[PDB]
């Protein structure tokens, strides 16, 4: 089964292995036990070239795992700015909500990735989106006293 090998190659950043596996019928949209796809894993571990490659070969840019995480959630959380822009350019839902009520904006704000916050805002991120506990991204900036983030959210 080439799907499990494609998952591993996407996580490990093996560009050539990804290309060979796809040419031999490997399921680009295969999932591991928790619903993570090769695109999820490449976005998590920062392999930009593999992200672009998968998107040109039928990867669902808005796939969700068991917890409702999209690839954009994970790229925003880990802080890969280049991958965030590639995903948005290929139709990623900027306001996707996971099972904790978080949007990519929530996660970029929490982790302090201010440049990613700006990009998400420029692409229509909803500042009124509340997580499961009622918090918007702006609420998180006030409750943490992060003045730099608070300024950005009122640009």
């Amino acid at each position: 089964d080439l799907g499990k090998k494609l998952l591993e190659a996407a996580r490990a950043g093996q560009d050539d292995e990804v290309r060979i596996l796809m040419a031999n019928g490997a399921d680009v949209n295969a999932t591991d036990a928790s619903g993570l796809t090769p695109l999820h894993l490449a976005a998590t571990y920062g392999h930009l070239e593999i992200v672009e490659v998968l998107l040109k070969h039928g990867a669902d840019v808005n796939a969700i795992d068991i917890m409702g995480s999209t690839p954009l959630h994970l790229a925003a959380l880990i802080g890969h700015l280049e991958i965030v822009e590639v995903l948005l350019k290929h139709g990623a839902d900027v306001n996707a909500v996971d099972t904790w009520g978080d949007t990519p904006l929530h996660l970029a704000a929490i982790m302090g990735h201010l440049e990613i916050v700006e990009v998400l805002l420029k692409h229509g991120a909803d500042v009124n989106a509340q997580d499961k506990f009622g918090k918007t991204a702006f609420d998180i900036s006030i409750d943490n006293g992060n003045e730099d983030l608070a300024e950005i959210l009122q640009k």
Partner: protein
């Protein structure tokens, strides 16, 4: 209570540790070769607390230098006082821990820890009346945090009756946007609540904020941050290094500052704030020093003290000034801000005056607060930890070194219980 054994672990630990030794050596009139060049008897009265007396009237820091990364060993030697440290007291491994708390605590770091204990023993048995230990480290990395907390636990069981004290620097995405650092800091805070008596929380978030917004440094360097740290560490150890009667050793400081065993994380503050190119800073008055000292902008932890209550406070004024004036201003700030102190600990603010000021200053004031507002710092880290941990991001880096995943849940649970305990005493009344 005399000798203190100083340990610095990891990159941040050795960096601020070296800066500490540079700054207090200058205060005590000690040159990079170890020779006393000073002009005051006060400088030597308590020199034994931090330095050993060597062969030819030479003073050697009672310091132990540790890192899994060899490169920092050479960077220490390259420094101004790099040749004053005992060559026997460098304990350095082969390869760094790669920001992996598990490598520091369980694998690489555990291999090297017995080598460190031997050096600790050799310095300890050489002491006439050992007080305890101070350790400088970061919580965000792998060596300082992972190996540091392992070293603490080992020392604590060999010297269970001595005081364990740490200067622990908290991670901030504003200084290092490395996403596993909330993991490492949370795992370390869990160790520190159980295994240290006193911890100075030095918050990189606060250090950045001060440099950027108050000192107006557009792009702060580690040298800019560490300038604030060295000034703080000099201030909070003043009472240990010069003659005095209040908080004059590590244990008397502890019983004055720690009313509940787990609530031993201190918020330090400093006035005036300077920027390595401080021009001709004019002397501040005692009332100015006193206000600035309780000001959120002067705290080395990113918390608003007005959002909580002070359980205990120690203040140290340095320089030549009217003792009567200090009594009046300290009394006054306690009257003005009476709602920010708990009423069920009477007389919980203690004041020391020290005659010798720090370099380049005629007046300075140092603040040591045990404040329930510190929960803002732990809640910040806890939120970042939970965002990463809920998606199980990079967990295999840790479990791959043998860590159980339940260690992550137990650490998170402990930090949340710590936050609840601060909130409990913040809401208590005397009734």
């Amino acid at each position: 209570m005399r000798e203190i054994v100083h340990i610095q672990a990891g990159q941040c630990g050795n960096q601020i540790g070296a800066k500490f030794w540079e700054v207090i050596s200058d205060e005590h009139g000690i040159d990079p070769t170890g020779s006393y060049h000073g002009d005051s008897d006060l400088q030597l009265e308590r020199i034994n607390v931090y330095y050993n007396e060597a062969t030819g009237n030479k003073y050697v820091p009672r310091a132990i230098l540790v890192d899994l990364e060899p490169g920092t060993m050479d960077s220490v030697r390259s420094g101004p006082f790099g040749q004053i440290f005992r060559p026997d007291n460098f304990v350095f491994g082969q390869s760094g821990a790669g920001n992996n708390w598990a490598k520091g605590h369980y694998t690489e770091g555990a291999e090297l820890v017995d080598s460190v204990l031997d050096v600790v023993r050799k310095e300890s048995e050489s002491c006439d009346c050992l007080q305890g230990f101070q350790l400088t480290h970061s919580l965000g990395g792998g060596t300082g945090s992972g190996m540091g907390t392992l070293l603490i636990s080992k020392i604590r069981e060999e010297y269970p009756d001595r005081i364990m004290n740490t200067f622990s620097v908290m991670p901030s995405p504003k200084v290092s946007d490395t996403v596993v650092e909330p993991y490492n800091a949370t795992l370390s805070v869990h160790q520190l609540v159980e295994n240290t008596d006193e911890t100075y929380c030095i918050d990189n978030e606060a250090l950045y904020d001060i440099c950027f917004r108050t000192l107006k440094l557009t792009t702060p360097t580690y040298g800019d941050l560490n300038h604030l740290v060295s000034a703080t560490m000099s201030g909070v150890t003043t009472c240990l290094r010069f003659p005095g009667q209040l908080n004059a050793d590590l244990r008397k400081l502890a019983v004055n500052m720690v009313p509940f065993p787990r609530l031993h994380f201190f918020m330090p503050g400093f006035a005036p704030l300077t920027s390595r190119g401080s021009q001709q800073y004019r002397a501040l008055t005692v009332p100015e020093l006193t206000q600035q000292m309780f000001d959120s902008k002067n705290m080395m932890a990113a918390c608003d003290p007005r959002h909580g209550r002070y359980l205990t406070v120690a203040a140290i004024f340095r320089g030549r000034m009217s003792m009567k004036e200090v009594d009046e201003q300290m009394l006054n700030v306690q009257n003005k801000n009476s709602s920010y102190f708990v009423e069920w600990i009477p007389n919980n603010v203690k004041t020391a005056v020290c005659d010798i000021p720090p370099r380049g200053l005629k007046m300075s004031a140092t603040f040591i607060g045990n404040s329930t507002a510190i929960q803002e710092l732990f809640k910040r880290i806890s939120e970042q930890f939970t965002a990463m941990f809920r998606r199980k991001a990079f967990l295999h880096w840790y479990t791959g070194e043998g860590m159980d995943e339940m260690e992550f849940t137990e650490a998170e649970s402990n930090m949340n219980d710590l936050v609840s305990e601060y909130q409990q005493y913040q809401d208590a009344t005397a009734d």
